[PDB]
Motif scaffolding. Structure first.
Motif, short mmCIF file in Angstrom:
data_model
loop_
_atom_site.label_atom_id
_atom_site.label_comp_id
_atom_site.label_asym_id
_atom_site.label_seq_id
_atom_site.Cartn_x
_atom_site.Cartn_y
_atom_site.Cartn_z
N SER A 146 0.80 -1.22 0.00
CA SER A 146 0.00 0.00 0.00
C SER A 146 0.84 1.28 0.00
O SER A 146 1.92 1.31 0.59
N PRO A 147 0.37 2.34 -0.67
CA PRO A 147 1.12 3.60 -0.66
C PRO A 147 1.26 4.26 0.71
O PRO A 147 2.09 5.17 0.83
N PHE A 148 0.49 3.87 1.73
CA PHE A 148 0.89 4.20 3.09
C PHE A 148 0.41 3.12 4.05
O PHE A 148 -0.46 2.31 3.73
N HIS A 149 1.02 3.12 5.23
CA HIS A 149 0.56 2.35 6.39
C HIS A 149 0.07 3.23 7.53
O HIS A 149 -0.92 2.89 8.17
N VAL A 150 0.74 4.35 7.78
CA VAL A 150 0.35 5.31 8.80
C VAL A 150 0.20 6.68 8.16
O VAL A 150 0.94 7.03 7.23
N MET A 151 -0.78 7.44 8.63
CA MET A 151 -1.03 8.79 8.14
C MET A 151 -0.95 9.79 9.29
O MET A 151 -1.65 9.63 10.30
N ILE A 152 -0.13 10.82 9.12
CA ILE A 152 0.09 11.86 10.12
C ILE A 152 -0.67 13.11 9.68
O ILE A 152 -0.53 13.53 8.52
N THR A 153 -1.46 13.70 10.57
CA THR A 153 -2.14 14.93 10.20
C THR A 153 -2.45 15.81 11.40
O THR A 153 -2.38 15.39 12.55
N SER A 154 -2.77 17.06 11.08
CA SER A 154 -3.04 18.13 12.04
C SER A 154 -4.45 18.04 12.61
O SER A 154 -5.40 17.69 11.91
N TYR A 155 -4.59 18.37 13.90
CA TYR A 155 -5.91 18.56 14.52
C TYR A 155 -6.77 19.57 13.78
O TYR A 155 -7.97 19.70 14.06
N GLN A 156 -6.16 20.32 12.86
CA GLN A 156 -6.86 21.34 12.09
C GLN A 156 -7.49 20.75 10.84
O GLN A 156 -8.56 21.18 10.41
N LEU A 157 -6.81 19.77 10.24
CA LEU A 157 -7.23 19.19 8.98
C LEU A 157 -8.37 18.20 9.14
O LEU A 157 -9.31 18.20 8.34
N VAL A 158 -8.31 17.37 10.19
CA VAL A 158 -9.39 16.43 10.47
C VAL A 158 -10.74 17.13 10.63
O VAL A 158 -11.77 16.58 10.22
N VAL A 159 -10.77 18.35 11.16
CA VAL A 159 -12.04 19.06 11.21
C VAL A 159 -12.32 19.79 9.90
O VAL A 159 -13.48 19.92 9.51
N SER A 160 -11.29 20.25 9.19
CA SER A 160 -11.52 20.96 7.94
C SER A 160 -11.91 20.01 6.81
O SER A 160 -12.93 20.21 6.15
N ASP A 161 -11.11 18.96 6.59
CA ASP A 161 -11.38 17.95 5.58
C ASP A 161 -12.33 16.85 6.05
O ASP A 161 -12.22 15.71 5.61
N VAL A 162 -13.23 17.18 6.99
CA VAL A 162 -14.01 16.15 7.67
C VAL A 162 -14.82 15.30 6.69
O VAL A 162 -14.95 14.08 6.86
N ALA A 163 -15.36 15.92 5.63
CA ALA A 163 -16.14 15.17 4.64
C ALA A 163 -15.32 14.16 3.86
O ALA A 163 -15.90 13.25 3.25
N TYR A 164 -13.99 14.27 3.88
CA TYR A 164 -13.10 13.29 3.28
C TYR A 164 -12.62 12.27 4.29
O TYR A 164 -12.22 11.17 3.91
N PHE A 165 -12.64 12.65 5.57
CA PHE A 165 -12.23 11.79 6.67
C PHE A 165 -13.35 10.84 7.07
O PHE A 165 -13.10 9.67 7.41
N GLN A 166 -14.58 11.33 7.05
CA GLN A 166 -15.72 10.47 6.82
C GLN A 166 -15.57 9.88 5.41
O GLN A 166 -14.83 10.42 4.59
N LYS A 167 -16.27 8.78 5.14
CA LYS A 167 -16.04 7.98 3.93
C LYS A 167 -14.69 7.29 3.94
O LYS A 167 -14.11 7.04 2.88
N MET A 168 -14.14 7.02 5.12
CA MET A 168 -12.88 6.29 5.28
C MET A 168 -12.95 5.50 6.58
O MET A 168 -13.69 5.86 7.49
#
Length: 59
Positions: free
Chosen positions: A1-23
């Motif tokens: 797989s192109p990743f195993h772990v994903m690192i992200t900001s507490y800011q992005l999970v709320v901003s990109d939430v519609a993409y974080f849902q559907k996962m």
DNA sequence: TGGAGAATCCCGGTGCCGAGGCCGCTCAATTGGTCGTAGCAAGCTCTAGCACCGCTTAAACGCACGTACGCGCTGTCCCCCGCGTTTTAACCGCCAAGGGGATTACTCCC
């Protein structure tokens, strides 16, 4: 797989939430979970709803 | 009429990016029932729109005829076009910044 772990900001999970849902996540770290302590915070409401099989808080 | 040569077209090749279709989901359109009312209908009123007559004279028409002005012609000259040269700033890319608007923390006040 192109990743195993994903690192992200507490800011992005709320901003990109519609993409974080559907996962779906096998494991989740919240890396300084005192960020979550306000239940009125959107970053509490959102990360709560992430479909994750097991979750860990660091503090 | 010819010709030279520039300018416009066409034919096939290349590639890139946006048009057309697929997917997930929300939330806006639909189903069902309620209730108020407005504007559809029947009815009366009398306004004012249409029709006609007769008279008056100002407004419209046909004509004479003069001359003021529209138009084709001639000459010039100046100034705007077609083309080569010089130069500048529009375009592109990449980095900075700042600002502002939403969010999150923490206290005081109620």
């Amino acid at each position: 797989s192109p990743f195993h772990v994903m690192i992200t900001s507490y800011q992005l999970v709320v901003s990109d939430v519609a993409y974080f849902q559907k996962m779906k996540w096998q494991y989740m770290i919240l890396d300084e979970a005192q960020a979550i302590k306000s239940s009125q915070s959107s970053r509490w409401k959102c990360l709560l709803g992430f479909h994750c099989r097991n979750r860990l808080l660091l503090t």
